[PDB]
Design an enzyme around this catalytic site. Structure first.
Site, PDB file in Angstrom:
ATOM      1  N   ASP A 173       0.836  -1.195   0.000  1.00 52.10           N
ATOM      2  CA  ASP A 173       0.000   0.000   0.000  1.00 52.10           C
ATOM      3  C   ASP A 173       0.872   1.245   0.000  1.00 52.10           C
ATOM      4  OD1 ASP A 173      -2.251  -1.636   0.142  1.00 52.10           O
ATOM      5  OD2 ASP A 173      -2.321  -1.544   2.335  1.00 52.10           O
TER       6      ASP A 173
HETATM    7  N1  ADN Z   1     -10.862  -6.991   1.852  1.00 49.69           N
HETATM    8  C1  ADN Z   1     -10.061  -5.776   2.117  1.00 49.69           C
HETATM    9  N2  ADN Z   1     -10.433  -4.584   1.614  1.00 49.69           N
HETATM   10  C2  ADN Z   1      -9.714  -3.484   1.846  1.00 49.69           C
HETATM   11  N3  ADN Z   1      -8.588  -3.520   2.597  1.00 49.69           N
HETATM   12  C3  ADN Z   1      -8.157  -4.694   3.139  1.00 49.69           C
HETATM   13  C4  ADN Z   1      -8.878  -5.845   2.916  1.00 49.69           C
HETATM   14  N4  ADN Z   1      -8.227  -6.865   3.571  1.00 49.69           N
HETATM   15  C5  ADN Z   1      -7.144  -6.370   4.178  1.00 49.69           C
HETATM   16  N5  ADN Z   1      -7.088  -5.058   3.922  1.00 49.69           N
HETATM   17  C6  ADN Z   1      -6.070  -4.120   4.405  1.00 49.69           C
HETATM   18  O1  ADN Z   1      -4.881  -4.345   3.701  1.00 49.69           O
HETATM   19  C7  ADN Z   1      -3.795  -3.789   4.467  1.00 49.69           C
HETATM   20  C8  ADN Z   1      -2.516  -4.509   4.120  1.00 49.69           C
HETATM   21  O2  ADN Z   1      -2.056  -4.157   2.818  1.00 49.69           O
HETATM   22  C9  ADN Z   1      -4.225  -3.881   5.936  1.00 49.69           C
HETATM   23  O3  ADN Z   1      -4.117  -2.597   6.550  1.00 49.69           O
HETATM   24  C10 ADN Z   1      -5.709  -4.303   5.879  1.00 49.69           C
HETATM   25  O4  ADN Z   1      -6.561  -3.553   6.718  1.00 49.69           O
END
Ligand code: ADN
Ligand code: AMP
Ligand code: CL
Length: 345
Positions: free
Chosen positions: A300
């Protein structure tokens, strides 16, 4: 000097619940390494179970939110980024709402009708494995009607850059599709992320359709392999995937340059575009074991780091270095923690 609301993002505002998970938890809930799964009924006990454990870390999450709010954090200019998501009317959503406000991220949060609570991610951390169990919750209630609101849609019209993770396919596909169509229509910059292997496997139609509107596509090795296998790319899957995604026709059948970047953990990332015939590898920062605190959210941050520089006119290689820097910064921190901006560089 970017205008206000130059960058727009919509996604799932989630609360990360980071826990030092015991080893049985992974066998019990059939969790895999570095994977993420949407919570089914058989997973539901995991939230009350980890709650009985000490030293839980509650911190704002959500892939799209992580990326966009770090872009805002990197740029330092107030209100350059705007975010739209659906939270519930509880203390968790209030915390996320205030977290965004604290760093000058403009938000138009949709509020789910009670008693639907904001989504949460069970981040199970262990020495051997790291795995996530996501309960989307209020994030599913994100509607096209909310996005099509005059005061909300104005954020989309003013924007020149969009970032939407593949995770939003499960919550509001009609919304992200309407925006992607708008972006390509006005020759704007649309950035998309593969987000997770299961999205390419079970939502292949949506992923490929988004790619046809995307100018920049982000993905990692596992997502590239899953994507490539589904598309029958048996030989040299990762490279073939990057080439395939870059070479896909746009929705209007016009000739544009789509950039594709595939990250590979500690290994060199790959990149190419629809004009380039070759696939280039770009080396990444090397870490010692005791330097790695938490790699969760590194992808991210990578997107945030790249976009923040790329949209300000920085060359490809320069933007890649900024992307690695953003990821490396998150790696040395627990959860998606954005500290004081002065301590970034
Ligand atoms: N289904 C999802 N949709 C959006 N964000 C997500 C999902 N699953 C995990 N994350 C987020 O992805 C991040 C890791 O890259 C974590 O902060 C987590 O909250
Ligand atoms: N173990 C690691 N060592 C160095 N960099 C990493 C590591 N893990 C993640 N990163 C950084 O984060 C990006 C995304 O990681 P990933 O989601 O694993 O492909 C990489 O391209 C690197 O910039
Ligand atoms: Cl998201």
């Amino acid at each position: 000097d970017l205008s206000e609301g130059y960058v727009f993002g919509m996604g799932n505002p989630l609360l990360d619940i980071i826990v030092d998970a015991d080893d049985f938890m992974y066998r019990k809930y059939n969790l895999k390494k570095d994977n993420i799964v949407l919570a089914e009924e058989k997973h539901m006990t995991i939230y009350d179970e980890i709650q009985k454990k000490k030293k839980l870390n509650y911190i704002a999450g959500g892939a799209t939110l992580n990326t966009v709010k770090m872009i805002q954090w990197i740029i330092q200019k107030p209100f350059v980024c705007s975010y739209v998501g659906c939270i519930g009317a509880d203390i968790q959503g209030k915390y996320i709402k205030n977290d965004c406000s604290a760093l000058d991220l403009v938000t138009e949060f949709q509020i789910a009708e009670e008693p639907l609570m904001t989504g949460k991610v069970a981040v199970l951390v262990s020495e051997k494995l790291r795995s996530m169990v996501t309960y989307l919750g209020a994030a599913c209630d994100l509607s096209l009607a909310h996005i099509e609101q005059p005061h909300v849609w104005s954020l989309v019209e003013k924007a020149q850059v969009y970032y939407i993770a593949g995770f939003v396919i499960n919550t509001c596909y009609e919304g992200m599709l309407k925006i992607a169509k708008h972006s390509l229509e006005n020759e704007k910059l649309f950035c998309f992320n593969l987000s997770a292997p299961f999205l390419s496997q079970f939502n292949t139609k949506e992923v490929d359709e988004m790619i046809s509107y995307s100018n920049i596509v982000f993905g990692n090795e596992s997502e590239a392999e899953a994507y490539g296998e589904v598309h029958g790319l048996l030989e040299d899957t990762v490279h073939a995937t990057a080439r395939y995604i870059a070479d896909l026709p746009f929705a209007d059948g016009k000739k544009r340059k789509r950039l594709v970047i595939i990250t590979r953990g500690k290994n060199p990332l790959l990149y190419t575009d629809s004009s380039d015939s070759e696939i280039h590898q770009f080396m990444v920062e090397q870490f010692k074991d005791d330097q790695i605190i938490d790699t969760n959210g590194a992808g991210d941050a990578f997107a945030a780091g790249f976009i923040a520089d790329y949209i300000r006119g920085k060359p490809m290689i320069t933007s890649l270095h900024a992307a690695v820097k953003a990821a490396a910064y998150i790696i040395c921190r627990s959860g998606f923690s954005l500290g004081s901006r002065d301590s970034y560089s």
